[PDB]
Amino acid sequence: MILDTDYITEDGKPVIRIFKKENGEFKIDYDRNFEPYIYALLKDDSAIEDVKKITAERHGTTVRVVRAEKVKKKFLGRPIEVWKLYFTHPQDQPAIRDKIKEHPAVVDIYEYDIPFAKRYLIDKGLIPMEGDEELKMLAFAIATLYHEGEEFAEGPILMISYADEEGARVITWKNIDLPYVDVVSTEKEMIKRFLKVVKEKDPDVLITYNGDNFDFAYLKKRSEKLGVKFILGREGSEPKIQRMGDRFAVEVKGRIHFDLYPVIRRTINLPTYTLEAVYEAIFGQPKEKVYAEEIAQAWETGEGLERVARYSMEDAKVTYELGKEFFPMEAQLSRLVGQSLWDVSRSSTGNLVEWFLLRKAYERNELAPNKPDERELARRRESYAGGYVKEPERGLWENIVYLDFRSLYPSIIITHNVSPDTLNREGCEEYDVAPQVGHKFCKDFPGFIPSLLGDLLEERQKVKKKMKATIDPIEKKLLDYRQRLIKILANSFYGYYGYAKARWYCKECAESVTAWGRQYIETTIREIEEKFGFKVLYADTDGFFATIPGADAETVKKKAKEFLDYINAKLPGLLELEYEGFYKRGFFVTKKKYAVIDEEDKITTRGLEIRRDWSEIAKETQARVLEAILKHGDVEEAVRIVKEVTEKLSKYEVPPEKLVIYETGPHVAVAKRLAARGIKIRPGTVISYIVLKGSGRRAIPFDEFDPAKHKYDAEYYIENQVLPAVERILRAFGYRKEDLRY
């Protein structure tokens, strides 16, 4: 299988390198005959002789057009004849493209900024990560000596840990009596020892957590300080550092540097992205953090080195475990988009769609439009208006069904052939007109994007069938990832239409999809109201909550199934309405804010106060109010609960344990008290404090709370904690803040 591609320059000529892993053997293939090229649209074919003589300079050397050939391509559905201009080296293109564009007879130039190694994969039809080759992986982490006020990598590397199927080990230059610790004489010997393990193990994948912006940079500066050739690459190279906007990225030639940090940053949403928080969210198991001060103290005193070595071992162990969990998904994403795992794991949704489109465009002889210039880019940042949101019916409702469209936006794009190449195509015999906006889309031929989107949905179904039929659990997980990634790619096309940097950007397409979506949801609502007697309580973009106010639970379910059969027969093409849940009770506060409860008595919420500055009394009272309303149907009881809680708080009857806040006023006051005890100020959600009557404008750690010495601030927990947490819920029922505080 293909791992990656790149190029080196030898005597001014580019040489493509294909890094492969075939039958348990690493291989490098070379291609010295791939010519870089760009396209040029001319007003007259006679002008080609003027374009051939256009020259520029790279580094003293004169860059010129090697040869040209006239080709026939499609450009936004219309046939076009352009000149394919060949060059000696890919770096000739940035040097001459402006001089060719500025030529009067040149209407425009195309495909002039496509990286050579990526252009090779597309043009040769090569797909990375394809096949059943098993890759060898190795995770690693480092521990450093930190001092506040010193330059980057001023202190030495204390330990280097690594982990794989054989387990986790720690290399260090101090005596540690642990079975998994290997002891060397110096920091230099430790780094050299790590090089030998990577060389002997010869892993295809090097797994790190934030290795792009820390680990590799630290190792690089230390190896320069110690005079070590840090040869991690399979061809004898040192790790290559690249610039990715405001941050960095590291390649290790011949292998795949898989940095888990950007991957997990996109996949899951967490308050903090420390290695400890991430591991605990994915595996549900705890991981203790050992801070830089504790590491430095242990190394200088020589006391407690077992604890630091165990932490270093766990870092490598959990990084290998997380790498085993996220790599197969990224390998499937690489197969899907057609680019290396290295690029795919570090790219955004917009870039992933573009690279998929660029490959498909080449396959279909479709000339790709250019990226927007700075002027055009500013023109594409205009406001938006898409998605219907109904203002909800106020009050408590019973026996509610939730109905929604299956893939509304992709269905619209396919059904109505929405594409920049079908938009207002003159002489069209058949067309669909977008409501309100009035954009017409030709139906005479399949549009580029709807055609690909249709093939994606067909491929997804073929993948789902294979998944359900395969007994092999590893293959089932792989098919599951591919299937899920196809769904995500299909649901990225709408957003891509309105994506300012997109080559195939089309605001008319984007507005048309939302206008059609507004029409389908609004027509379905009036249909269920007029012909089935349902009341639509709330609706947002592709679904709605409905009920028959005086009907029982089985009656509402039956009528909903009958409505689905009715409207699905009327819906065109791929559009389909679905039954996605029944709820015993529910209330809809405002747009995007509501709460509902299923038959299993499970409360589902959206748009509630549930920030980091919150106590167990505020969380408990909100749950109690929600339960009284949704489970008992008693809104007056929910009010009495708040009145009871505020009265108990004012009379000091609430236990202090329910007043602890876990995390500017209280926070800075508690920070001073914690720093006074030797505890360093570190970013973490571990601060547990309680607010006292401080008579200032007051916070102490909960461990030090004593009822005989301290009295909590009842007014603070009423006005800043309990009331704000329940206020939005009870304001929907007509109650003000003052109607609850006794």
d(CA 605, CA 629): 13
Helices first, then strands: H and E counts in the chain: 23, 29
Give the closest residue to 545 by CA, choosing from 514, 587, 576, 608.
587
C-alpha triplet 146, 148, 150: angle, nearest 5° = 80
DSSP 607-652: S-----SEEHHHHHHHHHHHHHHHTT--HHHHHHHHHHHHHHHHTT
Pairing of strands 247-251, 688-691: unpaired
285: its two tokens? 């198991």
Pairing of strands 431-433, 181-183: unpaired
Contact 5, 340 (CB under 8 A): yes
Give the closest residue to 647 by CA, choosing from 617, 667, 610.
617
Contact 191, 160 (CB under 8 A): yes
Give the closest residue to 683 by CA, choosing from 703, 667, 699, 669.
667
Alpha helix (H) residue ranges in 338-447: 341-344, 349-363, 374-379, 408-415
Give the closest residue to 733 by CA, choosing from 650, 630, 644.
630
Q: Name the strand (E) or helix (H) holding 298.
A: helix 292-301
Q: What is the resolution of this structure in A?
A: 2.4
**Single-letter amino acid code for the residue at 172:** T
Contact 541, 518 (CB under 8 A): no
CA dihedral 558, 561, 562, 563 (to 10 degrees): 120
Pairing of strands 543-547, 535-540: antiparallel
Contact 672, 681 (CB under 8 A): no
d(CA 214, CA 224): 16
Strands of 13-22's sheet, edge to edge?
A: 2-10, 13-22, 25-31
* C-alpha distance across the termini of the chain, in Å: 72
d(CA 95, CA 63): 8
Residue linked to tokens 């059609």: 516
Give the closest residue to 437 by CA, choosing from 356, 501, 515, 367.
515
Contact 621, 725 (CB under 8 A): yes
Contact 190, 160 (CB under 8 A): yes
Give the closest residue to 287 by CA, choosing from 297, 279, 295.
279
**Partners of 596 in the beta sheet?**
586, 604
Burial class (CB in 10 A: 0-12, 13-18, 19+), 68: middle
Distances (CA, A) of 153 to 206, 218, 643: 22, 6, 58
CA dihedral 509, 512, 513, 517 (to 10 degrees): 180
d(CA 515, CA 520): 9
Return phi, psi of residue 500, to 5°. -50, -40
d(CA 560, CA 566): 10
Q: Name the strand (E) or helix (H) holding 455.
A: helix 448-469
Residue linked to tokens 């093409």: 573
d(CA 519, CA 320): 49
Rg (CA), the chain: 31
Pairing of strands 205-208, 256-259: parallel
d(CA 87, CA 84): 10
DSSP helix/strand/coil, 24: coil
Give the closest residue to 638 by CA, choosing from 626, 620, 650.
626
> Which stretches does DSSP call E strand in 288-434?
396-405, 431-433
d(CA 320, CA 297): 28
Distances (CA, A) of 337 to 119, 121, 475: 13, 11, 20
Task: Count the Cβ atoms, other than its own, within 10 Å of residue 477.
Answer: 15
Give the per-residue SS3 of 231-261: CCCCCCCCCEEEEECCEEEEECCCCEEEEHH
Q: Which residues contact 453 (CB under 8 A, 6 or more apart)?
A: 410, 413, 414, 490, 493
Distances (CA, A) of 529 to 4, 40, 435: 57, 57, 22
C-alpha triplet 335, 336, 337: angle, nearest 5° = 100
Task: Count the Cβ atoms, other than its own, within 10 Å of residue 441.
Answer: 26
- Whether the CA torsion 403, 409, 410, 415 is positive or negative: it is positive
d(CA 548, CA 532): 9
- How long is the chain? 742
Contact 541, 520 (CB under 8 A): no
What angle do helix axes 305-337 and 260-267 make, rounded to 10 degrees? 70
d(CA 674, CA 370): 56
Task: Please tell me what DSSP assigns to residue 712.
Answer: B
Give the closest residue to 298 by CA, choosing from 286, 288, 309.
309
Q: Which residues contact 464 (CB under 8 A, 6 or more apart)?
A: 479, 483
- Whether the CA torsion 248, 253, 256, 257 is positive or negative: it is negative
C-alpha triplet 161, 163, 167: angle, nearest 5° = 115
Task: Please tell me what DSSP assigns to residue 367.
Answer: P
> How far is Cα of residue 573 from the mean position of the Cα atoms in its chain?
31
Largest Cα–Cα distance in the chain? 98
- Whether the CA torsion 578, 583, 584, 587 is positive or negative: it is negative
d(CA 589, CA 734): 11
Alpha helix (H) residue ranges in 503-602: 507-530, 553-570
> What experimental approach yielded this model?
X-ray
738: its two tokens? 């003052």
d(CA 283, CA 262): 19
d(CA 14, CA 34): 8
Residue linked to tokens 């291989």: 27
d(CA 58, CA 12): 11
Pairing of strands 157-164, 247-251: unpaired
Q: Name the strand (E) or helix (H) holding 476.
A: helix 473-490
Return the half-sphere exposure (C-beta side, CA atoms, 13 A cut-off) of residue 692: 18
**Partners of 700 in the beta sheet?**
690
Residue linked to tokens 């998944």: 467
Q: Which residues contact 611 (CB under 8 A, 6 or more apart)?
A: none
DSSP helix/strand/coil, 492: coil
Distances (CA, A) of 456 to 360, 450, 492: 12, 10, 12
Q: Which residues contact 406 (CB under 8 A, 6 or more apart)?
A: 576, 577, 578
Q: Name the strand (E) or helix (H) holding 545.
A: strand 543-547
Alpha helix (H) residue ranges in 491-552: 493-497, 507-530
651: its two tokens? 């009379």
d(CA 212, CA 250): 5
C-alpha triplet 130, 132, 136: angle, nearest 5° = 100
d(CA 245, CA 267): 20
43: its two tokens? 């007003």
DSSP helix/strand/coil, 597: strand
Return phi, psi of residue 393, to 5°. -75, 130
Contact 735, 639 (CB under 8 A): yes
**Residue 70: left (phi > 0), alpha (psi -120 to 50), or beta?**
beta
DSSP helix/strand/coil, 448: helix
**Residue 236: left (phi > 0), alpha (psi -120 to 50), or beta?**
left
Give the closest residue to 40 by CA, choosing from 78, 77, 86, 3.
86
d(CA 237, CA 202): 14
**Single-letter amino acid code for the residue at 130:** E
Q: Name the strand (E) or helix (H) holding 343.
A: helix 341-344
390: its two tokens? 């109904």
d(CA 233, CA 240): 9
Burial class (CB in 10 A: 0-12, 13-18, 19+), 397: buried
